[model samples]
Target: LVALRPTNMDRERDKFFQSHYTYNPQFEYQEPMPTAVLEKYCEASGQFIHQAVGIIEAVLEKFGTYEHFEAATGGQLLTKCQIWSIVRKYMQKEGCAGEVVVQLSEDLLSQAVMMVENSRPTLAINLTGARQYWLEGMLRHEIGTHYLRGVNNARQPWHNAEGRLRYGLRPANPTEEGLASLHSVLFRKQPFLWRAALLYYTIHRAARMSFRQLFQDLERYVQDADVRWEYCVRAKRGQTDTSLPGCFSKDQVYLDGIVRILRHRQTIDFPLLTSLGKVSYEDVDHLRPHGVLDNTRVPHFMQDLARYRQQLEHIMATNRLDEAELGRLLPD
Candidate 1:
């Protein structure tokens, strides 16, 4: 029989994470969002994301969602910085070594933006009035499903024991990308941004086209290296600029991940779809199928994020013509 260790050990590890990595810096507070405002926003956004999750869940209830794929994805999710700070802390707790910021060069971000405008100009997605959709799509695509799978895999006991392996070791293949992408389609396909991200994955990442190959192939469409790099970088993970031309192709996890999920579900009998709501891989493994977390979840912070999302969507959708005052979600 497994003997229970004293509970105090859990406290030490908890303190270790709170003190360092996931440390939340002070965010300048704007107007505090009313509970009702946030509730309305998240309810709508949650419904949208849930549908996307449903599609993948219907296929492979066990392996399809980020809950199983990227166990530690909770940190990457967009929301009150406090939750993100917790996610960051957990990474440090897990003993990862890296700077904890996005840190893309401005030239790279600018060049990437320009490339999309010039070459795949059609990809210049308008967030106008679709802010809620954009935010929901991002959560479902980037973190809600994608990063969770990554974190879950990293947190695996076997993987933890092995430690510091390259991403290619587990999710570093087209399979992960296809599954993530497919999940987005199953639930979040209405927004153009999500569709564009899907196109990038299906056309480039899943196809495994090399940067040089894509650049040469797009001769008729994109005339310069900047434009090609633009699509490649944003298409990957905002990794643009000439310094990392071909290297940008590594972000195939979105589309490839989803694709594999659908195919895998063809034979599995698990309740895969319901597991997507769990907090971590272990959560999915235990909580989701057992029905601990439900679809009606609405944490205070997530509600706040929803309100902010609504305002942003209105601004984008109306092209700033409405001049609606910004909701007090962030510090000025």
Candidate 2:
């Protein structure tokens, strides 16, 4: 568990703001993201980001007009206890026997995060703030994607773990993230899920912009100052100095993964995407030919594969737009 804020927080805050940015101070452990890995990815796909932007803009144009149904149905703000209780019930419905412990933490940079140790799942909810809509989305994403994948991995044979561990050394792929983003969309079933779409749009824009620039851009869409700060901080989390040109850039996974998984649903098996645990899609390709795996488990909502595929198909068909022109407009 990480500590709460540091003792000299005022001084640290002052120092951080001196540069007119939120720098990761020396007091915290920091590691720069692997430049070679991110560089190679950027070299290949970074220019194509405009295509993602265009796609998201089209999605927003289609779905962005919902008049705050999420807000209209709001009840009292949920406590962490209430949130966890809902999470537990959701997990049970999903046919998961394992108990995932959920607790609140003030130290988390993000609103929520999940951790697993020795096969036990634990989640930390940010006590500093909460949004009911986000909490609902969090339960689906964290449990459906993160916790269940961990549980499924634990079921894998011990012999397979070592080879799978080596796969971790490869550059991060967004397989699980894509699945999680998909789950969030499926569960919400709201037109206002355009907000989630906007998140990917914001993060994609953040990839090239500095923290300040991203924050200002986000401010136009994100009305809440604290929420805007969180988005800005998330985009630039791993960097030592927030003023620098680069950000963590990992936020790209959410949208990129969503597009890849949706566009290639036929080529990539959805059942294996969820049931194969945390392995990247590439890892599954390697593991399947050996006949060394069995993934009988699936989330409750996805148990009816036929209907689920139909739902996914409907979703894609309704939202589909041509990316060819967007991609062609970019310089070679």
Candidate 3:
């Protein structure tokens, strides 16, 4: 996930921006995106993208531009040092074992990203891309969600690649990303699923629309040039021909998994879902006995089961996300 962004991203973006958003970005992926993966994403993306986009559009009509939406909720206003301390606190609070490393680097996805690695259990934070109020959200996201789950998985039988493949561990794609994404906005007033919404909407459109067209089209929601460009590049990444209709549609998972988990909330076991070390919700029942649940850890946010459920309900309500309404929003 970390290495997928084009190495020459900044330069190409500059060229594209300098051309006044008319030129298609010539992206270069370090590794090849397999055809099977693209085919799978296109299929799995389904009509959820359409439903999510409708919700997002409805939100936009009420909220005006993306800038206002972010400001009204919370924007990036935290410092690197502050974020570093927050991460360190989470490490201490989560009882992170030795060998796990955290670094705040600038040469990252430029001021708005955090990622975790499974091999070494490393947490990489961008030097200057955190919001003051939403800082806890970011920490709970990267450390509390991604790193903790991955570290816990390391102790399980499916620690290695072969074991994971054999034990059916890789299918939790949506929940993995979705749970993390949800953590990022758990306590927000609006609790809008901005990135995932834009991702699904942009990727869905990118499959049929050119880069330029998508850019102009996004102006309806995202007023900022650079912000819109970020979603454009994200949706259209790894494609040399941005003029052609294509997309990297893996981004749909956040909203996809959020809604899926919520829709089945009454039945799904929340404790087991997080405790079972990187398995899908459906795997919760079968894998419960397999987990060494004694030492399995969760973040502070998820410690209170009732409050967490209440927060999720609030998220669904604040976003105006009715399960039935979502179905109706789907295209025929």
Candidate 4:
């Protein structure tokens, strides 16, 4: 990876890369894949990413007024305590047996994130603030999809569970993220503005826009200063030298995942897709029958497969993706 660096590094740029972010030393201790292998993977995935960025740019150009959409949909800012109460209710409502610890953390990186432990799920909320309107959306995304998947995975036989941990990559992570976003959107009825914002940020990051550049671009379309700042920082997180043409780039998953999942669910069995829990699209054919059963673990929103299918269809019809174009963009 070091050998692949661009030949434009200055002294300050090196410092920013080294000092601007925290590193998880444990990952460094793990087996590292060869840079050549990683680069090959990037090469293979570049086409899909290019297509995604273009699709998002077009969508945003047409319908990208997120602030107006967010307001019309009734957004609100909430206190940490209020967020905890909502989160607690969601856990209980979902019949999740594991204890959910919601605590304010000064050092928490993002506004909120859930850390899944062997025993319980800890929601580390940043002291920065919590948006009330986003509370249910967060629960649906984190608890309904991610936390639920974690609990379900815990029930899987030891070998199967361990296999996923050892081998899961790329589309698996993106699939889970996409499903989480789906849960938040369809089941929880989160505003379209949130999804729009994600696409806008993703497009900018894919274009190699700097933090300041992306923020300025977003500000042109999105009126919320805080939202723009948060999205910009999120796009740049983990990478140093904000001015350089580099970013964490994981934000691309949101737009890519949703588009891929929507395309797949349009033709495939909806329940089977939901039941595959935290799996890549390719795994569904095998896992649907041999893997976990779709019973108590799947949420109520997804329990009625027909209704879920109907809801998905409605969104697909309204969102206006060209079937042929979608197929060309999202690979099987």
Better of 1 and 2 by lDDT: 2
**lDDT tens digits, residues 1-332, model 3?**
45457777889888888999898877777666665765666532556766577668767876876677666666666676777777677677767745467776665543345444564556666654456656677767777777777767777877778877777664867888788878888888778777777788888888888899999999977788877877887787666778888888888787887777777777787767777777787788777777777777777788888999898888877666776764455322
TM-score of each: 0.32, 0.72, 0.88, 0.71
Show where candidate 4 strays beyond 4 Å.
1-64, 105-111, 117-119, 125-129, 157-162, 165-171, 187-207, 267-276, 292-296, 322-325
Worst 10 residues of 3 by lDDT: 107-116
Give per-residue CA lDDT, model 2, range 137-226, as digits (tens): 676677767777766666654225575565442322577777777676563443133433555656566667766677668654545545
lDDT of 3 at 298: 75
Question: How would you encode candidate 4's per-residue C-alpha lDDT over 1-332 as one tens digit per residue?
Answer: 22222233234334433653222111121234344533332311243444444444444555566554555443566666776677777777878735677778654335557785566678776655556566676677777777767666554432265666554422466777777776666743423425533543544553466555665666555567555545554454433456654444555566557677777875665455545556676666656555656452777577777887776665554455446767776566
Pick the TM-score winner. Answer: 3
In angstroms, what RMSD does candidate 2 have relative to the true structure?
5.3
lDDT tens digits, residue span 94-160, model 1: 2432422322122332211111223221111122212322333333333434344444443433234
Ranking by TM-score: 3, 2, 4, 1
TM-score of 3: 0.88
**Each prediction's whole-model lDDT (CA):** 0.31, 0.57, 0.73, 0.56
Clashes of 2: 0
lDDT of 3 at 180: 83
Off by over 4 Å in 3: 31-46, 97-99, 110-119, 326-332
